[PDB]
Curated annotation (Swiss-Prot), chain B:
Assembly mode: Homodimer, which upon binding cAMP is able to bind DNA. AR1 of the upstream subunit binds to the C-terminus of RNAP subunit RpoA, AR2 of the downstream subunit binds to the N-terminus of RpoA while AR3 binds to sigma-70 (rpoD). Interacts with SpfP.
Recorded name of the encoding gene: crp
Cross-referenced PROSITE patterns: CNMP_BINDING_1, CNMP_BINDING_2, CNMP_BINDING_3, HTH_CRP_1, HTH_CRP_2
Protein's name in the database: DNA-binding transcriptional dual regulator CRP
Taxonomic source organism: Escherichia coli (strain K12)
Feature: DNA-binding region: 179-185
Length: 208, 205
């Protein structure tokens, strides 16, 4: 740890080879199907990784945040496509560099490949969990897990009745696979089970 | 890039530091929950990567084959646990190595980390549509989609009425995350729906 701020010059070395660019909230950094030729690094902000179906429904594969790489999957063979959309959820600052350039950096210092790889490992772990949720739990179950997750981060909040979070009906729906209005119906149901206290900023009692 | 008497120096080098053990079908290579300290590579055979619900219901994350690393997700951070179960589909020949050893190898030649990484990238790419479906489709939609997928595989046989496939009730269940019984019921519905013929094999449309 560099304490609160863990920057390390490996990072700064890395970053000095990139151009940093800003993106307002809801800007799309990456479009599914685009040719993959560029790697991103999130200096500031957080993003949504999402996929769409044939009707236009969107679901969230993951949230990523500062310190996270993005656009890394097309890096090990060329001629690939972006596997998903990536959208800024907040204002963002993101470093970017060509794949060839990045491939060059690796030669010099493979610890950058190690750090990237370690992120991919974590993503697969997390995907495995998310897959059991989606495959086994019913839409209420997925919603409760979700809540229980959003609250399990240092970006959440605290409260006598537990921890509070800032999430919307569309958000949750995109994470569990259901409408806006279903979520509302299910969030009322849980409040009723005195599982939560909602108000735009949900209050998860916490325990599971 | 040479490699006789088969596949490259870099992998032959890597295997000589492994120990190769033999797994019979249905045997478990990797148990979920367990401390991760070693890496595997499949020399021969195929395995199933899977997870289960509270009541043992099974969901296949992926099949893996000869050439595939297994057990890698624990390598990058200490104290990780196995994210899923891994079971021999067929008899397997599996090389195995400790993470500590593998990391020294990485020091000697980062090529081997590149090849490992390329596979993890692939595994995230392929899981993306599949995870999409879990949210977009219910079990029936997912069962239909699976049959469609299966019928577009190279191993699908032509049929005068369409494409014939070989798959059991339980593999479908394992593919969509439901019981073999549920699969039997829904296959019958799709049948009555004149979408498929279900019998000694499955004929899609
Ligand atoms: N199975 C599903 N059923 C309905 N909406 C879904 C499903 N999977 C993902 N979604 C969606 O997630 C969004 C949540 O908010 P909306 O109701 O505005 O629109 C919804 C669609 O984009
Ligand atoms: N399951 C996932 N979890 C986290 N990020 C993901 C997942 N699937 C894809 N991504 C990403 O979103 C990016 C889309 O472009 P790439 O495929 O080039 O690189 C991808 C990763 O950054
Ligand atoms: N989505 C996936 N695709 C392919 N293999 C996977 C996936 N998720 C997990 N695996 C694996 O199965 C192993 C379970 O143990 P590990 O978590 O150590 O390492 C894991 C990988 O080898």
């Amino acid at each position: 740890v560099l304490g609160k701020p863990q920057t390390d010059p490996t990072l700064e070395w890395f970053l000095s080879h990139c151009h940093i660019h800003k993106y307002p909230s809801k800007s799309t950094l990456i479009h599914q199907g685009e040719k993959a030729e560029t790697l991103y690094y999130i200096v500031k902000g957080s993003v949504a990784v999402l996929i769409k179906d044939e009707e236009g429904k969107e679901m969230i594969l993951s949230y990523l945040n500062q310190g996270d790489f993005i656009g890394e999957l097309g890096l090990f063979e060329e001629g690939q496509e972006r596997s998903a959309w990536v959208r800024a959820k907040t204002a963002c600052e993101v470093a970017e560099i060509s794949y060839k350039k990045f491939r060059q950096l690796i030669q010099v210092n493979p610890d950058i490949l190690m750090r990237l790889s370690a992120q991919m490992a974590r993503r697969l772990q997390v995907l495995a969990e998310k897959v059991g949720n989606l495959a086994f739990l019913d839409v209420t179950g997925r919603i409760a897990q979700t809540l229980l997750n959003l609250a399990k981060q240092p970006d959440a909040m605290t409260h006598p009745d537990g921890m509070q979070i800032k999430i919307t009906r569309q958000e949750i729906g995109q994470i569990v696979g259901c409408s806006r209005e279903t979520v509302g119906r299910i969030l009322k149901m849980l409040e009723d089970q005195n599982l939560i206290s909602a108000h735009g900023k949900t209050i998860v009692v916490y325990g599971t």
